[PDB]
From Swiss-Prot:
GO terms under cellular component: periplasmic space
Annotated transmembrane regions: none
Name assigned to this protein: Pseudoazurin
NAD in keyword set: no
Gene source species: Alcaligenes faecalis
Length: 123
């Protein structure tokens, strides 16, 4: 299956967001990131992707189709607006083994609050 994600300057949760910012997927699924607004990209955060998944980085303003394989949680960001809270969390499979680690990992205070909200009122 495919899951469409939009990158926007302004969304329900504020400025610089991924909608949806919580993505539940299965191995083999694809996630397509569409920058409806310009000046955005998608990139995996170091140490916040699973076991053997490979890191990735898209081009600014480009549509990017990610194929998810390894089960576990992935924290991704917009390289350009990471500091302002632009993140999305992808959960591949049930009970992702690295979720608690990611939630504890060090990262900007604004992304943390955003991350807390996506796991809470959502899932
Ligand atoms: Cu951005």
């Amino acid at each position: 299956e495919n899951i469409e994600v939009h990158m926007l300057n302004k969304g329900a949760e504020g400025a610089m967001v991924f909608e949806p910012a919580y993505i539940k997927a299965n191995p083999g699924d694809t996630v397509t990131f569409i920058p409806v607004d310009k000046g955005h990209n998608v990139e995996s955060i170091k140490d916040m992707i699973p076991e053997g998944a490979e890191k990735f980085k898209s081009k600014i303003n480009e549509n990017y189709v990610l194929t998810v394989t390894q089960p576990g949680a992935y924290l991704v960001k917009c390289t350009i607006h990471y500091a302002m809270g632009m993140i999305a969390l992808i959960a591949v499979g049930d009970s992702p083994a690295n979720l608690d680690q990611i939630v504890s990992a060090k990262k900007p205070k604004i992304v943390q609050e955003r991350l807390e909200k996506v796991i809470a009122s959502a899932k």
